[PDB]
């Protein structure tokens, strides 16, 4: 297929030294997500542990097929933070089954407060678990399809195609 291969390659070229790598790598991967998924935009939350409970605090936000990582650096005091019982972010944190979510409005558990924090308008979503140690560390979502209401199956294949890589990076 080669796409994912030299896309993640060229993506690793795009990275340069600063502080400062893997998070922006996941950023660029969100870019590739909103590209091959033809999404208007994307986002990711860290699920960093505390009190023995991982918390799906927002990190990357309003990520487009771009949106600069500098733009997405929300203050941890100001970041939206999801406990395991709130949102499909914390629900994937709570279940870790792969989840096509054709309509969050119907395939619920979703927290639409993300629309508040991002200013984005949620319609549908998908997710796969991402973990380090015993801890969970990430949740990822595509946002607003550009050309049509919904994905066909090979786009879901793309969704695994780069969320598996996001799974690979934050570890």
């Amino acid at each position: 297929r080669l796409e994912e291969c030299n896309i993640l390659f060229e993506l690793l070229t795009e990275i340069q030294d600063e502080a400062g790598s893997m998070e922006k790598i996941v950023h660029k991967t969100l870019q590739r997500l909103s590209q091959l998924l033809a999404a208007d935009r994307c986002s990711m939350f860290i699920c960093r542990s505390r009190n023995g409970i991982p918390e799906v605090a927002t990190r990357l936000l309003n990520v487009t097929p771009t949106s600069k990582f500098e733009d997405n650096l929300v203050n941890p005091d100001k970041e939206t933070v999801f406990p395991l019982d709130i949102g499909i972010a914390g629900w994937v944190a709570h279940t870790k089954k792969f989840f096509n979510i054709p309509d969050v409005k119907k395939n619920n558990h979703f927290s639409d407060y993300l629309d508040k924090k991002t200013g984005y308008t949620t319609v549908n979503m998908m997710a796969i678990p991402i973990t380090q140690g015993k801890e969970v560390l990430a949740v990822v979502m595509a946002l607003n399809k550009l050309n049509a209401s919904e994905f066909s199956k090979e786009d879901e294949e793309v969704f695994k195609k780069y969320l598996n890589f996001i799974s690979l990076v934050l570890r």
Partner: protein, 161 residues
């Protein structure tokens, strides 16, 4: 992304400071300029250790023993050491000047960040990488001036024969 640009900042500091070996004073001009331009610190001061005492022009001299002080404690240690709450000073990036080694040739300290009121851990190691080029420029330009003054004064002693 933005990541390349601060590496090319190292490109700039390289292509600059390696061309300014002819005089350490002009070297200080270019360094203070580039540093006030890029470090985002409103001010800074650069100590230079000598056995048990630091030396700094910030051209009135400023001095502080390696045992005394917090920056002097850095002279004792060479630890990069952020001070997010300084006590319009409000933070200090206190890291060694260094050069060839982690050994304390001196102790720089930045003050008052632009973009993010606190110094970050990002506002540490990058300053150290900048201090690679600066440290080489200092050790080798001083290496140049010492040979100049000394070996020149030698032929000044050559006079009678």
């Amino acid at each position: 992304q933005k990541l390349k640009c601060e590496c090319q900042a190292l490109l700039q500091v390289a292509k600059n400071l390696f061309t300014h070996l002819d005089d350490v004073s002009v070297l200080l001009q270019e360094i203070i300029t580039e540093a006030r331009n890029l470090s985002n610190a409103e001010i800074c001061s650069v100590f230079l250790l000598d056995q048990n005492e630091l030396v700094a022009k910030v051209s009135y001299e400023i001095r502080i023993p390696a045992d005394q002080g917090i920056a002097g404690h850095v002279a004792t240690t060479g630890q990069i050491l952020n001070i997010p709450d300084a006590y319009r000073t409000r933070n200090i990036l206190c890291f060694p000047i260094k050069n060839e080694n982690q050994e304390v040739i001196g102790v720089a300290e930045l003050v008052n960040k632009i973009n993010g009121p606190w110094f970050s851990k990002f506002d540490e190691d990058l300053a150290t990488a900048f201090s690679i080029y600066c440290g080489i420029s200092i050790a080798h330009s001083l290496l140049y001036k010492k040979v100049n003054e000394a070996q020149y004064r030698s032929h000044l002693a050559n006079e009678m024969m």
